[PDB]
């Protein structure tokens with residue numbers, strides 16, 4: 001029993017965190033094979049011209065107490081790739097994946113190439129992440145673990161004026177309409193990740209918290225008209241299908257749970273809580289709920 | 299900026315998780331140097347669950363009864379002994395991934411990261427606090443026994459908890475790494491209930507300071523209170539009393555924000571009286587009590 005916000009074990013990623021220094025800027029880098037990936041803003045803007053002026057010896061890369069020899073450098077979008085003379089002996093099986101809004105991932109927050117914390121978060125529909133980051137965390141990565149394969153999905157780049165965070169996939173492409181330049185940028189109005197709220201209600205039913213269940217069902221169209229009104233993301237037929245296994249396990253059809261959600265929005269919680277929370281949680285995907293309520297290991 | 303429930307990186311602990319099997323029972327073990335620590339109830343049969351005599355059961359066991367598996371390598375158990383409710387299995391190989399470590403016993407209110415494991419394999423990492431009733435509100439399934447709670451001291455891992463059992467309410471009970479249970483719990487199938495849980499008041503105040511550091515000020519007020527008047531209001535809401543030690547521990551946060559402890563205490567009193575009025579603090583509609591003053595300082599500085 002129990003339901004916690006749970007991150008993937010960070011070991012496989014910790015063995016990849018290195019410190020990257022260029023001039024007065026020190027941030028984190030991801031050492032995979034003989035390549036170190038880090039935000040291109042470490043050279044700081046005309047990034048192509050700035051990188052042309054740089055030499056391999058300008059980049060100081062440190063892995064623990066060993067300095068790595070940079071033997072090449074190139075740029076892929078907003079990420080800098082530093083070729084090094086040594087393959088990371090702790091390189092896990094990995095992939096670079098681009099995630100969608102709603103999908104969750106674990107973040108390994110680092111400072112000076114040293115992992116300090118691991119937390120689970122979701123890529124918000126407005127493409128920001130509500131992370132916890134201080135100065136020096138740039139280069140910290142977001143990942144998922146698929147069987148025994150690390151899927152790198154995020155690299156931290158900056159903090160927006162509201163305190164939310166922005167970053168890129170491991171190919172340097174930003175998530176959202178953000179740029180890595182000191183200019184006024186605002187996150188769009190965020191919305192709630194509806195499929196994740198439904199997944200979290202299933203997790204509550206699995207844990208015995210069932211006060212919110214009602215006799216009602218709804219059509220997907222009627223649910224979406226009501227959800228749109230409360231700044232909730234539309235629920236697609238893909239989401240209904242993904243919630244299938246949880247619907248079968250709990251005996252609560254997706255449209256049946258949608259009518260529970262529909263009432264929770266129009267009426268509130270009435271002083272009651274669900275999984276120790278007075279708000280509807282939207283940072284647990286249907287896969288996270290299944291994984292946590294079935295004990296999948298890594 | 300931002301405030302998240304943040305666990306310590308679990309790598310140093312993952313390299314210590316092994317699978318321990320004795321008869322039909324399979325749970326997790328912690329491999330440190332040439333010793334594997336695991337809950338002693340792994341040696342229990344079906345009949346010996348309500349009132350097991352662990353000394354008597356362990357005397358009947360031989361080293362060849364314990365199957366220890368570290369990855370795809372079976373470890374040779376060359377000795378066995380019991381320290382309180384923990385079984386110590388000596389093995390013929392020192393764990394090459396043994397980190398710098400200490401065995402620490404924690405107090406209610408203290409937080410720690412939990413590495414949930416199944417069959418000696420880490421599946422998840424989450425943050426926990428030792429509840430005032432000495433239980434932990436974890437997320438555990440059958441097979442999670444032996445999963446450990448830890449904190450990281452720069453390079454050193456302080457092991458503070460080993461999961462043993464789930465109480466009837468769904469909350470969890472366990473021991474320090476010396477086998478001593480936290481709370482009035484025993485590793486027997488006898489009827490056991492957790493006492494009424496209370497809110498870790500000092501942790502709530504630490505969390506309100508974290509909110510002020512993050513720019514949340516709506517809950518602040520012009521009032522101050524005496525420590526005695528705050529404690530009388532707090533107990534009525536099932537909140538732990540706040541001692542002079544807690545006021546002193548909140549000192550650095552009070553200096554950083556410019557809000558005295560008794561000033562924040564009056565804000566907490568007002569919050570308990572009115573509720574949140576549809577507003578949130580750090581994205582939460584409830585007062586969070588699983589961030590210690592030490593966690594808040596660490597995460598904000």
Ligand SMILES: N[C@@H](C(=O)Nc1cncc2ccccc12)c1ccc(Cl)c(Cl)c1
Pocket residue numbers: 041133134135136137138157158159165179180181182183299
């Ligand atoms: N120095 C960073 C930055 O703001 N990175 C930080 C990350 N997370 C949290 C931070 C909190 C405080 C200060 C800095 C933070 C930066 C600044 C401007 C731009 Cl346009 C870019 Cl791409 C990157």
Ligand SMILES: N[C@@H](C(=O)Nc1cncc2ccccc12)c1ccc(Cl)c(Cl)c1
Pocket residue numbers: 001339438439440441442443462463464470484485486487488
């Ligand atoms: N079978 C275990 C147990 O309850 N261990 C589990 C741990 N966490 C969560 C669990 C959820 C479901 C089933 C089992 C769980 C057990 C039972 C009685 C006693 Cl007295 C002891 Cl020491 C240990």
Ligand SMILES: [Cl-]
Pocket residue numbers: 242245286287290
């Ligand atoms: Cl699924």
Ligand SMILES: [Cl-]
Pocket residue numbers: 526529530539
């Ligand atoms: Cl008193």
